[PDB]
Amino acid sequence: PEAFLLFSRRADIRRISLETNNNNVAIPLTGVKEASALDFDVTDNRIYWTDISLKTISRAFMNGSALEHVVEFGLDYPEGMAVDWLGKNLYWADTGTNRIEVSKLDGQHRQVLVWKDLDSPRALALDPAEGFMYWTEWGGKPKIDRAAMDGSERTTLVPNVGRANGLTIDYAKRRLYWTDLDTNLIESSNMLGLNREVIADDLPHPFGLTQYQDYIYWTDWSRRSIERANKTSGQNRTIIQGHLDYVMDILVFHSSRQSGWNECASSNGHCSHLCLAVPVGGFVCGCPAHYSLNADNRTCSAPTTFLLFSQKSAINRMVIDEQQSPDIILPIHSLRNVRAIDYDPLDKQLYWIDSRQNMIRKAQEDGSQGFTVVVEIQPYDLSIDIYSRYIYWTCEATNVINVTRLDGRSVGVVLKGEQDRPRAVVVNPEKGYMYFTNLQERSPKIERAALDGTEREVLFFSGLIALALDSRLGKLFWADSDLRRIESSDLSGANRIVLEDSNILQPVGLTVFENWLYWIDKQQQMIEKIDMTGREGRTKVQARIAQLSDIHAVKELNLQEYRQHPCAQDNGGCSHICLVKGDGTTRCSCPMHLVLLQDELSCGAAA
Template sequence: MLPPGYIKYHSQHSCVGSIERGFLCFGSPLLLFANRKDVRLVDAANSRNSSVIISGLEDAAAVDFYYAENSVFWTDVSLEMIKRTYVNGSQTSTNVITFGLLSPDGLALDWLGEKLYWTDSETNRIEVSNLNGSCRKILFWEHLDQPRAIALDPLNGYMYWTDWGERPKIERAGMDGSKQNRSVIISERIHWPNGLTLDYEDSKIYWADAKLNFIHSCNFDGSDRQPVVQGSLPHPFALTLFEERLFWTDWHTRAIHSCHKRTGGNREVVHSDIYSPMDIHVYTAKRQPASNNPCGNNNGGCSHLCLMSPQPPFFSCACPTGVRLHENGHTCASSPKEILLLARRSDLRRISLDTPDYTDVILQLSDIRHTIAIDYDTVEDYVYWTDDEVHLIRRAHMDGSGQEVIVSTEVEHPDGVAVDWIGRNLYWTDTGTDRIEVCRLNGTSRKVLISEGLVEPRAICLDPMRGHMYWTDWGANPKIERANMDGTERIALINSSLGWPNGVAIDYQEKKLYWGDAKTDMIEVANLDGTDRKVLVSNNLPHIFGFSLLGDYVYWTDWQRRSIERVHKVTGGERQVIIDQLPDLMGLKAVNMNHVEGSNGCAENNGGCSHLCLNTHPKGPVCACPTGIFFELLDDQKTCVVPDGFLLFSRKEDIRRMSLETNHNDVLIPIQGVKDAHALDFDNSDNRIYWTDASLKQISRAFMNGSSLEHIIEFGIEFPEGMAVDWVAKNLYWTDIGTKRIEVARLDGKSRRVLIWKDLSDPRSIVLDPPNGYMYWTDWGENPKLERATLDGKNRKTSDMLGQDRRVMVDTHLLSPRGITQYKDFIYWTDLEKKSIERAHKLTGHNRTTIHQGHGDYVMDILVFQESRQPGWNPCGVDNGNCSHLCLAHPSPPDQTGTANMTFSCACPTHYTLDADNKTCLRK
């Protein structure tokens, strides 16, 4: 083995070593080759003299070097990367190109202009970058079909490559990617042109064909084709040249061979028993001769890339992929002006529309699982996307920095997302929760806007200038709907001849609405009010999904065609494929990076709103408060505050809340599937509400914002009329008119037990006093009464709250009073027949006021949601009294002083029995 150290060209010999250790010099060349698992140097005259430059590689394929800096570059087709190391024995490497590669089979270094060129036989591209990977640009992307080997002639400004696709060939072009200089120089008697090398002294090309088993040569222009080695090579792969000899690797023989470059004679095996020989070069300064560098003076005056060219002035300025070159021919724009943002299942991509290559660049983001929808905020440079697998909405800057989660709870299947770039809000649809929600762009102030009548909401787009939002719903009755941006004034614009309306977009200038339908296989357009509906495209749309509009064009993704396409928005013509054969295409957003559309009253100081500013038509901006965080809007209609308490009431098919302190406006709590809500209660510790549903014959619970709906009691229940929460022991009590029982269970519905079943005629309302261990209920039987028992169902007695000081508070104009509650100095009650909520002073009955007058459903139960409404403690509040199932508190027998302290009993669900420890329940 050669000692580690620097490799230099010294005198007329190849030398390996260091100044400190001296040089080992050889008259024969050093061969640099990739061996899949490592990159090596070997003495062409004595294969025992070899050195591993870097080892432990995955799948090294192509290799090249920069002699002036003692560095080696290679491609790894498994890691899909290009890397660099130095010939100094350190075996350390740096990444050069880390994304956007699939099969980088060819690599070539421009030692004059200090550029790196490569081919990719999967993406079918030829690209260039600086040696550190910056300013990456695609040079050729059309009419390539599995390009492989690539060789450069920076002395004359040409590049050469082989293509072993359906029409094998060898091409050449200017190193600046000019189409005018591109030409096919070999297209006959060629099949698998694997290797390619240049003879700069004789102006010759040499290539190896692995199918036809030969090495041929020709002039740089393809003329004077000559056989060198004919028909006797098992499987040649790569080749190189030094002075009068050719060297090549062979997959079949697993060796490096050589011969005379003109005659093919003097063949010999240079090095054998190679694990997997791939690319090869002669490592010498002679293969990278010095010459005039037209880019050497101030980078040719180019702002970014200066690339060699075969035509005067023998260089061209170029820009990174997707960035347009200004008319001055030297300066690049700072970034693309128009782009497409694409959501794929496992990544997000950016496609510049400024340049004709339409290259898709993967955004450097982490933990992308299953993206669906995507949008972009030009003001702060944030990409927003939904992920259906991890149930999140995220954002990040275009360069991948600042990645963060915006919405992380109660996200099930977020199919649509839209940025309100004026009001600085984010809207989304969720086909799992069947909601449309909004929050600030940073995820705060979340509010449910629409929760009723949505079946399969998908795409959503906004018109902040006019105060409208539009969305599609592909449920049983598909439709396209519109509402104000606060969810009011909702109407169905299109509700006929639709199947799966997957995408929707707005032309703000022409006031048009566009949509794509994956079932009718059409793209249609109408006015913003739904009138003047027309078909724009009706052919070759197998499964349209993502949808967007920019300038004169409508863009869409197609699942079946695996493509992104566009057509003119007026004529439906000029149809063009932007990206083809890219699987897993989802959402799409076309963006003008330099333009922000319109304004409204929310643009300045958030419209004066403390939380959400939502534009509406024709009213204009309105302030709104988050859902589920107990805010209410003050009379100034600007400020959201946390009230001391508020009313909760059930209204047959929904549950609502209402301010107690300010304007008494009621707000719908967005809970799905309520049919006939009766009794209500809550647990303040986790902000859950509980209710009975007489139609569904079940008891359910959800958080105050309507999320996490659970049906906790679903069987063995006939008409659940009354219900109450024991907030200390975390138990739930209810009365059932049908079964004539009072039952108890844990708050999650488990450990269910019948407490009272005897002498109950028509049990109705029930309330609890956990700190004192009592429950109270009404019975509407033949002898109506109010009863009391301890929380374990014992010590039952007829009661009127100890029978003392009974007074009539209100006795006029009561038609059918139902629910009742108390807050501060007032009592509140519902009246079924009047469909109202009223209040009066709790001691005198005076100051009677109707605070809510319904116009639809009956108002059923009512209660005050307030932290102080659930005070106190009992022994069940600590570790459930160490009971395995139910802990039921009750007063202890009075002591000698007549004081009754609180104690408890453990109890078991039906079909269980209490063990001797009086703590543990065992199945019978």
């Protein structure tokens, strides 16, 4: 078990034997572009590295096998990364998003630990045996901060230093080592930022840093070298290898570097998701992003109410809490030209339209269970009947309101007609109605019809691309891009009141979150909201978000109130379409290619 050095340079993570020389070759990796930060798990014999050109964090065994991209979403510049080898967690710092995030070595249960008051955090060093994490911030007045490995107890450890890199922990002597890139020095301190000593003051430009036994190894971008020296006096310097320009990270791969123990290593602290280390040598259970910790301090609960705004290449989730949690990009693959989204709160599964692939797809929030429900046919918008478990959606090609089941089997075409172009759709199954836009040439309109295409009337005629609906407020909302404004009305058609119409360029989406009206401006790249109770007024939620496509609010499904709808219990006995009448009973109906039968429930052909 011979100790050796490992360093990243361009697209090569390479190995340099310390004692004598052997295996001075690169680690056989396939798709590396710009390797940066490095760490390892010595018992699993695996290496972990980041990539800026790819915006990824990958892991692979020492022989290049089992190369997998652990983190591949929501990364901008992961210049720092470290491995919790006891709790088996992966920490990293991003200077583009300015946040320190944690997950597992597998990659699941990604959580943001620090996100406030961060100014470009880069170097990262962990100490799970004591429950502390240390990092360096390169922003205005750079500094070195310490926090508990769950994000709490964050203080400033070194305030006077310059831009620090190569933060390395000597666990035996209990000391910190780092390099000052502005004064071009190598310094050390104790675990509290005190007893500060200057290890080396005459080096050209030390950059990366690591420590092993009584020796300190550093890189030099001026001399383009890897050197080592006595960690105490700073002398007995030898050049390990030269002609190495722009070596990003460097470290010693040896078991003695990863010792210690906490409860997370023994039993994962009996936590459901994350086990994070805290002082002193203790632990607390952590949850995925947007998840909350239950009363047992062990299990995590997914968020029940939230927002979902999707752009051309991503689908994101917003959460409103007092701590102002950051938005999360849902790790769903094969997202090309997204145009609409919806969500089923019963099975808790997300649905969306993909225009490029030209299909409607569903998947869980973590990305699992990818299922294609319909696949020429150009779907435009969609809306879910969560009671009949149906999806109503318009087609841009056939110009038709078509309805399909969640399992993919079509119930049939509900609306069709010449000189008709139905685009946006929203369903109100509590009242058995559906509202949609009809963009006829030189004649737009907003129409309502029953969930079977009958009782088709015209609601809004003159003065005019997305509809929102709220039954609690009894209000219908829409937004026009030509006139560039947003309007509201009642479900019956009365009180057509114009909302805030100024400072709007190109509205695309609308939803109702509690007593608020969220809408997205695509060209202005904004997510805003209007207070529905008329108290706080117009407010900007987020600015400069490109390629926006849709937004969808999600309230928690009260299953007690859900089971009360007669359309939900075996579809009210109706094959196909169940309709709710004024009195509250049900009445069956069917698409245009079928006809109701004697039992007033089933349907079929005719002759």
